Amino acid sequence: GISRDSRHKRSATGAKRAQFRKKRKFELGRQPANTKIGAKRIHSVRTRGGNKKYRALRIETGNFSWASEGISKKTRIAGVVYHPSNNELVRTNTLTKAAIVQIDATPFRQWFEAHYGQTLGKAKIESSVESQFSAGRLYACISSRPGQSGRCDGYILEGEELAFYLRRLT
Amino acid sequence: VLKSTSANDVSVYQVSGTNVSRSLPDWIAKKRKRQLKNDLEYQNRVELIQDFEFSEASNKIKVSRDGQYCMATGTYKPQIHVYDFANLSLKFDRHTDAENVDFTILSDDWTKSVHLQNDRSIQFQNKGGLHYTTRIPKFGRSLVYNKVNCDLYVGASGNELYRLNLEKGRFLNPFKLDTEGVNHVSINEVNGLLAAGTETNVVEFWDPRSRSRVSKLYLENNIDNRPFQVTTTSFRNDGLTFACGTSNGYSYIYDLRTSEPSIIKDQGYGFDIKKIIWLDNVGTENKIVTCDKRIAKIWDRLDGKAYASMEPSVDINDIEHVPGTGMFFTANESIPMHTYYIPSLGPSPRWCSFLDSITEEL
Amino acid sequence: TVQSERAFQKQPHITKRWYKNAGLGFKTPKTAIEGSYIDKKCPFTGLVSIRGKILTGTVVSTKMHRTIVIRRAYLHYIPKYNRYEKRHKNVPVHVSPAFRVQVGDIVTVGQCRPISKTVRFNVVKVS
Amino acid sequence: MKLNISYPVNGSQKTFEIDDEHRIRVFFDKRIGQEVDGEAVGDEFKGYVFKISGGNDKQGFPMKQGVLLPTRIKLLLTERKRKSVRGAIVGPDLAVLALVIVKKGEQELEGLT
Amino acid sequence: APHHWLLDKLSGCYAPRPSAGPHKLRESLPLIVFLRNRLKYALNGREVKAILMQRHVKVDGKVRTDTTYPAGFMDVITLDATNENFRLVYDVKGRFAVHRITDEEASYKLGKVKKVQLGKKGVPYVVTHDGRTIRYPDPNIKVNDTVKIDLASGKITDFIKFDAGKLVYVTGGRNLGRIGTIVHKERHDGGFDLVHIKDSLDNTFVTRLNNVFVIGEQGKPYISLPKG
RNA sequence: GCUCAUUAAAUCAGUUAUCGUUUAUUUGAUAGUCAUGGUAUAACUGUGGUAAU
RNA sequence: AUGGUAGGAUAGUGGCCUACCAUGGUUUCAACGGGUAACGGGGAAUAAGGGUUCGAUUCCGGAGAGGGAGCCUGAGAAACGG
């Protein structure tokens, strides 16, 4: 399918267009699955004989980590918010690496109450996140490759990195 | 065949999808394992049609006007599936570089095949393998060829509207966009007026013989929750009245008298209006299909009451219709492609000649 | 400005600044540790390993973004004529935001698991 | 056509050549799995209940379970090839009609029961 | 056919290819060349097979039954017949040399480490040139050093750090395979370190640091070099 | 394995670099967390169709 | 075309591909372009113990299995004994 043969494009000095050989198997390329948010379907690819890759195409749940307390809780996925490479992906709700999403705040909420003894801004954390706990939708980012591992794994926004993205969302 | 009531007292008949199970996708492994391990009387009751389990549903589904054909736009190892209703299997299975967002057939029975790729490009596709590939300035959502003017002109999320002629194979003097909402393209059959789906809910009527847009039509709502865009449009085969489908589920039904009033009719969910097709060919006419992401619905345009609510469990994104019949082609997000037929709409076609008999006698 | 791109720039961290030594007697500058540039392709504080050719030359053109051109002059010896020929080899290299480079700028680089289509060398020392 | 009749309760099986068109007409447009009384087909078949099971046509192409279309078509068959497939539904161009006895009636067949 | 096998060009067309194994294939000498061809123990190729299946030969403390089994530099090849022990050592002129050693010298071999890292669960490990990886070495043992190996177990009884002024054997390059005990270590572009060597006639010779194999101190080598 | 149509920093030759990678076989290291479960292919037994496999 | 960054794809590097961002690259030290009958050339490799420089061996480079195009297994093929 996709070929990565470096010959056809021009040289540094402008020499070009040899077609020394035809396209072969080791210079291969396969295709993106623009994964969405839905009932989780797992794809199968056989790569270089022994190994395999996980295309993702529909994702329901994924594992996100809360960075302040360092705990990890599996997250139900709702919607896509921001991505820097192309905003066509967000308006089609497509997951890639470094993609801003919205999540359910209630799995991180249930950890906060019975383990500590407090509610969520009706044990001190940031102000811009504590107002988002009442909204039920927390903002999170992706730090995995769904095109390779198939998982929706990532990190929730905190710190000055929170202030960078929320400036873009207004 | 299971018969399902849509609670409209109009019995809806379905096949080939979420309820039909093919226990022998591979007869070499499973059906040899079925003989000593089962009686297979339920599988003896299951009647598959045209022999495909086909993942990664499809971006679009098309049918030909002649030969009783189907196009299917697979995305697994992204591919194009062609079906013959005479032979009931794959005739032509080609794999594509990137996904075609919308497909357009040239005039009939896939003499050619025209794609609208995720890479900003059209692929020309013949009987032979992958005859020509193009490049487009912007990304693609929809495309329509017109037999008149020999032009296949495209546009999505662009500042200009891109006018390519297939005679002499060029593009020159392209049209422009008013504030870049061009999600959809639809053409009048009789008089050839262009339809457009805009973020500010405007339909742009560009006359190709005048090289210029005629008028704007705006949408207003009684509830009016959010700023909405019309995602897909349609023209009647008569060329009289207009179909407008917004993102909030509210069907807008317009008149080509250059006149603003409409009739409103919503789905219960209102997630989107996916595809709108006029039932002007089939008897008991003036009906029109309105489909959500999940809920599909056909209703009389002057009456506005539910004749059928066509609801598969897995969500879809596509409708395709065979004229004179109730043959409905939907791309449910699964391995089987749920197509389904309502006989109380109209008679079954000639390849479905026994397929009408199996359900009423049962 | 640090955060001028469309994505948030950060080190992967494989002070709020993580450092490492590229080795071979190339010292970590003040701009590396107490700086503001992220530069995942930088020899110090980044994700490249200097192994292979450590070469030197003269920087001749700097008008690109985050990269420069080394001109590598030398003399060829032709055995047939028993003469010399003056030569040069214009090599483009990635420069890091720790080294103050203009036309001139005697430079030292290191082979860095080729970065982009001609760049095999990243700037590690400028004199 | 011929009726390849099997009786699995005893396990025996026997074919009957049937040349009369009144006898075959009951089986027309019936499908594999359907319950068929041969008492209209024959007086010695009084009370019998038959299920259609399989068979072939006059060119060897078998009826496959529930495909459709009582003409012949070509299918992608099981590493998969394409051969010609005769449909699931009984037509007059069948050389045979193999079936199976479901409920037994009054009279008996010597070589069968 | 390569240089260092001492085969004639005669006696048959095809050269006996080496098997994959511990040593590099161009560095290897197969056992078919070792038995019937140089030591003249067998005559035909089939006669090598009868010796191996009866397990007469053992290489480096293992049974080692294979016709084209790759034997390389510094390999104790113990033959159970004759009570004689053989150690391969390269000859200056470009070729390999079969050498007699003692029973105590057949106990130990020397091995150049090629790469050292930290294994799983915090375990140091060194990787010899014969591919013998050993858990828990001395942290003094670092890159390009030799390792004395017990061969009853995989243990390390002696180790010699690379320092200038110690008796070095060369494994590779043009000037491959002499004494010369060190001049110093040069740095160059791309690495390409040229560890200089001055022989018994005190003449400078230049090969790569990759080719350097430390076979002893200034004065003493740890193994019985063949004298001639 | 045979046959048809001529490439100038390309091939090739050596050289690295693989801390940029994948590897069946080769070799060397390396794992404390019901006297017998449940399925399953056929061959075969006999009936046939098909100009034919 | 030169590069930046982000994503994708891949066994992996990577403008490989695409967004967005800068205007660069090689060059009288000859870039780039043209001619090559490139059966000419490679110590690739022994060779001829006086035939004066002879030999044989290996390497060319690419494509194909009626023509196009798409695919599947396998460490490896984009395999014509699918």
Walk me through this protein's architecture.
This is part of a larger assembly, with chains A (170 residues), B (362 residues), C (127 residues), D (113 residues) and E (228 residues). Chain B is mostly beta strands. Chain B is 5% helix and 33% strand. In chain B, β17 (185-187) and β18 form a beta hairpin. Chain B starts with a strand and ends with a helix. In chain B, 39% of the residues are buried. With 127 residues, chain C is mainly beta. In chain C, the strands form two sheets. A five-stranded antiparallel beta sheet of chain C has the order 5-2-1-6-7, with no helix packed on it. Chain C has one helix and seven strands; from the N terminus they run αβββββββ. Chain C starts with 29 loop residues before the first helix and ends with a strand. In chain D, the strands form two sheets. Chain D has a five-stranded mixed beta sheet with strand order 2-1-7-4-3, with no helix packed on it. A two-stranded antiparallel sheet of chain D has the order 5-6. Chain D is mostly beta strands and 113 residues long. Chain D has one helix at 21-24; strands spanning 2-7, 12-17, 35-36, 49-54, 72-77, 81-86, 98-103. The radius of gyration of chain E is 18 Å and the shape is globular. With 228 residues, chain E is mainly beta. The two termini of chain E are 27 Å apart. Chain E folds into three domains: 1-104, RNA-binding S4 domain (Structural Genomics Hypothetical 15.5 Kd Protein In mrcA-pckA Intergenic Region, Chain A), CATH 3.10.290; 109-159, Beta Barrel (OB fold (Dihydrolipoamide Acetyltransferase, E2P)), CATH 2.40.50.740; 162-228, Roll (SH3 type barrels), CATH 2.30.30. The chains are: A alpha+beta (170), B mainly beta (362), C mainly beta (127), D mainly beta (113), E mainly beta (228). Chains in contact: A-B, A-C, B-D, C-E. Chain B binds chain D through residues 26-28, 41, 43-49, 51, 86-90, 351, 353-355, 357, and chain D through 29, 32-33, 65-70, 73-76, 78-79, 82, 88-89. The structure holds two RNA strands.
Can you lay out the helices and strands and say which pair or pack?
This is part of a larger assembly, with chains A (170 residues), B (362 residues), C (127 residues), D (113 residues) and E (228 residues).
Chain B: E1 3-5, E2 11-13, H1 27-35, H2 41-45, E3 61-63, E4 69-74, E5 79-84, E6 89-95, E7 100-105, E8 113-117, E9 123-125, E10 132-133, E11 143-146, E12 151-154, E13 160-161, E14 164-165, E15 170-171, E16 175-176, E17 185-187, E18 194-196, E19 206-207, E20 212-213, E21 230-235, E22 241-246, E23 250-255, E24 259-266, E25 276-278, E26 287-291, E27 296-300, E28 306-310, E29 327-329, E30 339-341, H3 357-360
Antiparallel strand pairs in B: 1-2, 3-4, 4-5, 5-6, 7-8, 8-9, 9-10, 11-12, 13-16, 14-15, 17-18, 19-20, 21-22, 22-23, 23-24, 25-26, 26-27, 27-28, 29-30
Chain D: E1 2-7, E2 12-17, H1 21-24, E3 35-36, E4 49-54, E5 72-77, E6 81-86, E7 98-103
Parallel strand pairs in D: 1-7
Antiparallel strand pairs in D: 1-2, 3-4, 4-7, 5-6
Chain E: E1 29-30, H1 31-38, H2 45-53, E2 57-59, E3 70-71, E4 76-79, E5 84-91, E6 95-101, H3 103-107, E7 109-119, E8 123-128, E9 133-135, E10 146-149, E11 156-160, E12 168-170, E13 197-198, E14 204-205, E15 212-214
Antiparallel strand pairs in E: 1-3, 2-4, 4-5, 5-6, 7-8, 7-10, 8-9, 10-11, 12-15, 13-14
The structure holds two RNA strands.
